[PDB]
């Protein structure tokens, strides 16, 4: 169930410095597999996961075409946007776009997203009924009109349900050893006295995949949402993640603090305290 | 493969 292919697009002006610039990255779930960067010597689509390096040239040539196209349409949209908002040519602005497709346990398209931001704010976004849009402001509302006329939600829906999903699967079969494995965390709890009066412990999840996890310091077996601290899941740098969670407490109150960690490759949501 | 985007 619930696999997905997502692309992430970023393009920006650089008045005073140089030509707009366009960058794209594709993931399958939480594994990035492809990249493209406008500023390259001769921009080309390059791999990022081992398992895609297996496609023949037609794949590279084709996506390199689509990105060279996607390069120019953004140079262009950058410019159109300076028109819809009365913006000067001398300030740099940015476009960001995510689109992707989720597939069922069976593999049909479960959900599909396409989402535009200008300058950090939402711009235009396609709705769950892959036909309509939510337009952030008046500018996006021109776009919305422009796109209803070109029936450009239907073009979108044709891709999602066809080219993406077809490829979503074509990959998953090539990199199944990578992409259909769930790596459960290697978890450890650590001992840190900030004083005799008060001492903190730390729930450690290391080298896990995918990036989804829950580290909950259960006091007496309860969440303690307001007194605990946690860092956002971070990347290891191989294709794996790590998160930690800590809490400050009076000493000798150790064992009643159990750490609940749930993760996709975990049969039992593991509860753990730890001492020497 | 990747989508090609509309203008505007």
């Amino acid at each position, epitope marked *: 169930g619930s696999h997905s292919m997502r692309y992430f697009y970023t393009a920006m002006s650089r008045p005073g410095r140089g030509e707009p610039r366009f960058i794209a990255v594709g993931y399958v779930d939480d594994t990035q597999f492809v990249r493209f960067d406008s500023d390259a010597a001769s921009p080309r689509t390059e791999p990022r996961a081992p398992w895609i390096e297996q496609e023949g040239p037609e794949y590279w040539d084709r996506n390199t075409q*689509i990105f060279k196209t996607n390069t120019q*349409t953004y*140079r*262009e949209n950058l410019r159109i946007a300076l028109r819809y908002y009365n913006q000067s040519e001398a300030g740099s602005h940015t476009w960001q776009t995510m689109y992707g497709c989720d597939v069922g346990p069976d593999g049909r398209l479960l959900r599909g997203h396409n989402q535009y931001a200008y300058d950090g704010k939402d711009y235009i976004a396609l709705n769950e009924d892959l036909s309509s849009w939510t337009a952030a402001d008046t500018a996006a509302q021109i776009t919305q009109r422009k796109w209803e006329a*070109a029936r450009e939600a239907e073009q979108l*829906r044709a891709y999602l349900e066809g*080219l993406c999903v077809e490829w979503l699967r074509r990959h998953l079969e090539n990199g199944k050893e990578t992409l259909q494995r769930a790596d459960p965390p290697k978890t450890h709890v650590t001992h840190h006295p900030v004083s005799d009066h008060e001492a903190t412990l730390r729930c450690w999840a290391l080298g896990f995949y995918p990036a989804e996890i829950t580290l909950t310091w259960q006091r007496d077996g309860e969440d303690q949402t307001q007194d605990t601290e946690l860092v956002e899941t971070r990347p290891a740098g191989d294709r794996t993640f790590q998160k930690w969670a800590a809490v400050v407490v009076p000493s000798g109150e150790e064992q009643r603090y159990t750490c609940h960690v749930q993760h996709e490759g975990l049969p039992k949501p593991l509860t753990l305290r730890w001492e020497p | 493969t990747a989508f090609t985007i509309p203008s*505007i």
Partner: T-cell receptor
Amino acid sequence: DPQALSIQEGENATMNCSYKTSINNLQWYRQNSGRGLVHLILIRSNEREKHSGRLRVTLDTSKKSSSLLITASRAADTASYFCATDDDSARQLTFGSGTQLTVLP
Amino acid sequence: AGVSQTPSNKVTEKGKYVELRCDPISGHTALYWYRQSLGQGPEFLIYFQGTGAADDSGLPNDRFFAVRPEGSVSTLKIQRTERGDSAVYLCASSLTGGGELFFGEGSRLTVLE
């Protein structure tokens, strides 16, 4: 380069083409006549079937072939008829050979 | 009334320089060029998105080059003209990219020995 069709006026013309390319986002039907220009109707890779006016378009994405059918064909309808596919949703239309239609009285 | 291409006819010999114009629909961002010859499909040439090429894989060779400075009007430049190049060159306009193509009437260009 699917032969010319001559048919009698009022009776139904049916033209076929086939695209080879990976997916298409959509497929188009184009009317090209005398020296002039080229011209239109559109079906998506996710709908089997679409009607406008006297036209009915059909898409089979397993045989990567389509069928345009003109209903009650008239003199005006005499033109060559061309397929276009949008090749990887990547917006360049690819046109096929298509078909010399001649509706005679 | 639509995408005016110009000059509807050009007739020259080997080795000369030809300049095909086309003025597309206002507010259309994509501008395609195609070419076609007696009883064949139009073939792809180049495809502008605003002020520049986003795809030029149709171009058969370095003698072919198109332009569209101000983003509206395009121009097709051919050089060392040859018999081979003889065809109708089609100019189209899309609103956003792909979907419905609005062609101009064309320019019939014959290149003789």
